[PDB]
Design an enzyme around this catalytic site. Sequence first.
Site, mmCIF file in Angstrom:
data_model
loop_
_atom_site.group_PDB
_atom_site.id
_atom_site.type_symbol
_atom_site.label_atom_id
_atom_site.label_comp_id
_atom_site.label_asym_id
_atom_site.label_seq_id
_atom_site.Cartn_x
_atom_site.Cartn_y
_atom_site.Cartn_z
ATOM 1 N NE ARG A 1 43.178 54.079 86.624
ATOM 2 C CZ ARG A 1 42.250 54.082 85.667
ATOM 3 N NH1 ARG A 1 40.986 53.806 85.963
ATOM 4 N NH2 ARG A 1 42.584 54.352 84.414
ATOM 5 N N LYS B 1 44.758 59.706 65.150
ATOM 6 C CA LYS B 1 43.512 60.050 65.828
ATOM 7 C C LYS B 1 43.755 61.229 66.755
ATOM 8 C CB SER C 1 42.260 60.969 80.464
ATOM 9 O OG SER C 1 43.485 61.155 81.117
ATOM 10 C CG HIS D 1 47.917 60.988 84.537
ATOM 11 N ND1 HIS D 1 46.906 61.531 83.780
ATOM 12 C CD2 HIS D 1 47.970 59.677 84.211
ATOM 13 C CE1 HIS D 1 46.349 60.589 83.048
ATOM 14 N NE2 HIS D 1 46.976 59.452 83.287
HETATM 15 O O1 LIG Z 1 44.206 56.440 81.953
HETATM 16 C C1 LIG Z 1 43.960 57.605 82.379
HETATM 17 O O2 LIG Z 1 43.477 58.465 81.616
HETATM 18 C C2 LIG Z 1 44.258 57.975 83.801
HETATM 19 C C3 LIG Z 1 43.964 59.206 84.424
HETATM 20 N N1 LIG Z 1 44.369 59.127 85.656
HETATM 21 N N2 LIG Z 1 44.923 57.935 85.868
HETATM 22 C C4 LIG Z 1 45.490 57.541 87.123
HETATM 23 C C5 LIG Z 1 44.657 57.365 88.211
HETATM 24 C C6 LIG Z 1 45.239 56.987 89.404
HETATM 25 C C7 LIG Z 1 46.615 56.805 89.471
HETATM 26 C C8 LIG Z 1 47.440 56.980 88.374
HETATM 27 C C9 LIG Z 1 46.863 57.357 87.180
HETATM 28 C C10 LIG Z 1 44.888 57.187 84.785
HETATM 29 C C11 LIG Z 1 45.407 55.741 84.616
HETATM 30 F F1 LIG Z 1 45.276 55.030 85.782
HETATM 31 F F2 LIG Z 1 44.663 55.079 83.674
HETATM 32 F F3 LIG Z 1 46.718 55.754 84.210
#
Ligand SMILES: O=C(O)c1cnn(-c2ccccc2)c1C(F)(F)F
Lengths: 155, 155, 157, 157, 157, 157
Positions: free
Chosen positions: F90, F41, F127, F17
């Site tokens: 991703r 929630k 997350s 993020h």
């Molecule tokens: O859902 C999440 O919790 C999460 C936590 N890091 N990243 C993320 C990972 C790589 C690049 C951008 C964001 C996400 C996402 F990809 F799902 F957006």
Amino acid sequence: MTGAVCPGSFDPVTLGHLDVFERAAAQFDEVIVAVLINPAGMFTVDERIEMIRESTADLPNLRVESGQGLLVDFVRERGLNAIVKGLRTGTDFEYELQMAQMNKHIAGVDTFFVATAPAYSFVSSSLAKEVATYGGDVSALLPASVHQRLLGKLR
Amino acid sequence: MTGAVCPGSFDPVTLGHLDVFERAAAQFDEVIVAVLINPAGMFTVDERIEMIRESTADLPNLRVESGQGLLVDFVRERGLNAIVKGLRTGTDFEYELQMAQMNKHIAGVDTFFVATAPAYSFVSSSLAKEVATYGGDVSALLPASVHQRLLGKLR
Amino acid sequence: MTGAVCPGSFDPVTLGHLDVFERAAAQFDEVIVAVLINPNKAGMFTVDERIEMIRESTADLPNLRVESGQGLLVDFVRERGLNAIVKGLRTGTDFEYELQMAQMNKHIAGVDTFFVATAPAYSFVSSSLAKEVATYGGDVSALLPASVHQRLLGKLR
Amino acid sequence: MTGAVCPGSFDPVTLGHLDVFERAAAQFDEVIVAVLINPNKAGMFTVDERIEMIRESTADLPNLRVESGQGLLVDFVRERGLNAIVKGLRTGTDFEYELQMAQMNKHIAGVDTFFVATAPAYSFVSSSLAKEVATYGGDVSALLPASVHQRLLGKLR
Amino acid sequence: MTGAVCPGSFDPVTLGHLDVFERAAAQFDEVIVAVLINPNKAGMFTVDERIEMIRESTADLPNLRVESGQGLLVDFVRERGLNAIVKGLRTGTDFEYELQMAQMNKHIAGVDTFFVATAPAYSFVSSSLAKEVATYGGDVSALLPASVHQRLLGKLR
Amino acid sequence: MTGAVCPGSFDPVTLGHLDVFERAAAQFDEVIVAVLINPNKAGMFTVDERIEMIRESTADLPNLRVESGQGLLVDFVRERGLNAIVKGLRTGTDFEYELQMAQMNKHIAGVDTFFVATAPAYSFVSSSLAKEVATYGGDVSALLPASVHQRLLGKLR
Ligand SMILES: O=C(O)c1cnn(-c2ccccc2)c1C(F)(F)F
Ligand SMILES: O=C(O)c1cnn(-c2ccccc2)c1C(F)(F)F
Ligand SMILES: O=C(O)c1cnn(-c2ccccc2)c1C(F)(F)F
Ligand SMILES: O=C(O)c1cnn(-c2ccccc2)c1C(F)(F)F
Ligand SMILES: O=C(O)c1cnn(-c2ccccc2)c1C(F)(F)F
Ligand SMILES: O=C(O)c1cnn(-c2ccccc2)c1C(F)(F)F
């Protein structure tokens, strides 16, 4: 008076194509297999048509014709407006979806996709020719007639 | 005497579903919409059936019925062996391919997929309900009847 | 006793390939890197150049050897008494294509294929893209072993 | 002063491309459309014809300009004092191949890429498919800017 | 001594799982099937029932053994002196989610993951779908080991 | 003048993020991180905890601010006079799902969405997966900012 066109290059037809033909023939009153001449392959159009006719003798509501130009013109000039095509992967779906939506846009022709039989998920005309060229046994993947005809082309 | 079943929860039916219904009805002599009770949604089975019947009045070869249990039993108990379903993404295809091959294996029932109309690529019953719940305008995505009925459920 | 073949054109080998080699060498008693040559289309590097670039960057892997071949991969595998191919994969798209070939290879010869997920840092390097970027002057030194980079720039000049 | 480059071959520009241009011009202070000339593959329209078709269709976008480009895209971007690319995406496989290029471009030059989802109406239009359909008499007038269509009929006669 | 862990819930084991077990046991000196107990979601068969169904179907695999596991998989793997996982894959989206977990497992513990493509005949079978079909009277006997099917009919009565 | 909203639940924020935040802040005059709360929630972290973890790891981004909200994202965006959402992606699978929501958001409110490819090193952090791995004792310190790691371990203990 329902009907659908099953298109492809069919160079050569495989058991995966034949499975789609039989499934289309079971759900539509009339099926036309459209052998599309793309004017460089292994078999001539006439030979490709021959091999499909030999392998579809048990399907009385199916015929085989060559075609050029837009598939939608081939379909509509025969009074139909549906195409039936086999799909193996989601990747197949995305590429074919673009052509299906274009075909609906330009000519009102619908496209119905059927999932490949599991046993043929890995067979394609190109991979079967490549493997056979280097000596691999593809006899379980091709109609019995086609298999002999393919050996002849190689030897 | 060709025919196909169009299944789903249809809670509520969207213009994306209705587009698939009209396309199936144009290519098969008989179409049955199967409203599958999954025994928690917004509309009751009877209301869901009602909204589909209202929106499919121009389709004379289509009827709407509820069902439980295996879809293939619903299909075969009506003398049919084809299912027609709409697809939006390659991801949709992969999930549905598993069920389509299972259904063919256990009961010989074929599945034909149709590509979503481009205009409805983003509409689903769940997203339309979510957006409407928070005050967004989904009237261009739902049959006119359904839209009024959805507002009533919220207010 | 156990063994696997890691095939490719390796024109040239990348850090993503080397990662796959190291992971295969850690899990199988012997690994053979199979440099598959198309006798009908020359690549950028000759067969001997490809082998030397791989050997120079795998010197610390004592159970790995490098050999070239052509034709059916399954014949290369079985002629060495082995029954397994190990390949790296980057995407789901990689997987559908490679799944076709893996199932065909199992069908025609009984050879299994094991896929391994790319290391994240190399998710985007491919021999073809590194060659294309280098051709137009982009810096790809961090995506290729030392054994490759300057030989690549020499080919381009 | 924010800005981004919108690259492509645009042979010809489609309404899908124009939707991307309009969305980029609404969010960045400056947008440059980069018409990528390829010394090998010369398509249906010359570079200058492609530029003039884009200028006609973007006449209401004052912060967007159109230029030809050659070679490495990240050099084109950075030579103009920018460090962002904007591209439209139609499908998940669009994303896959484009993701590799975006990560490569970020690695080699620090240039970022922002992707925008196609408008639903144009998810199926591409320059190549529009040309092919038009070549055999299909009507693609609803998929191309008004001016492209006339120019496209002329090239086919 | 090479080895790998084959994890899953196996509720119940399918012929797709067994195909993976057989291929892993043919390529590694030792294979451990890890039957993952979940203190929350308790499915149709107890852990011990699942273990006994796998042992019955793997009786001809002398280098494969079956054990229950709980908690973090990479601890299970490393507590047994191994550092490889083998898992079957059916689709490109299988690969996507599994790829994230494999990269995570490699990062947090150095454990590698090898994926094998499903045999074509079982690309559509899963434990969850087999249970659902069987619950409503469908015949899934060709998709499960002989012994599972009898045990599955008993649980449904 | 230009601006974008970066939405999420950020429970907790990850390095993936933060990479997206930094790239948006480099390309838009102002960025608002929108912490979207589900009033029905509870997550692991309260709203104030989520905001403080983001603020502590974005202190070097002077044009970024952090605000919570609920309900329709497009209302959050438009109430601030903005018209753009920036989100990281991703995989191609990420893209199909997010494409649905982006096209709906454009349909109902005229808000555009710009997607950015994950940095390779974070392709596998989410997350949810970081929370799941930490729950069972795996080391996720390299995937989360300093502002998060020990607060996460405290929540779990
Ligand atoms: O859902 C999440 O919790 C999460 C936590 N890091 N990243 C993320 C990972 C790589 C690049 C951008 C964001 C996400 C996402 F990809 F799902 F957006
Ligand atoms: O292209 C080919 O060569 C080819 C050959 N068999 N099958 C095919 C395979 C499985 C199910 C349906 C068709 C194809 C095709 F689907 F990719 F179209
Ligand atoms: O689930 C839904 O809620 C839903 C609502 N509209 N459409 C749908 C959309 C486009 C084309 C065909 C159908 C769906 C479905 F396809 F996902 F099935
Ligand atoms: O095609 C290539 O040239 C190439 C070069 N590096 N890598 C690669 C990248 C990451 C992990 C494993 C391999 C490839 C591959 F992914 F395509 F296999
Ligand atoms: O390549 C092409 O020829 C082409 C032509 N229109 N569109 C396009 C379509 C929809 C939205 C954005 C662009 C493309 C592209 F996306 F594939 F780039
Ligand atoms: O989850 C399940 O229930 C299940 C049951 N069979 N197979 C499976 C199917 C084919 C090849 C390998 C395994 C799975 C899995 F792959 F999805 F893991």
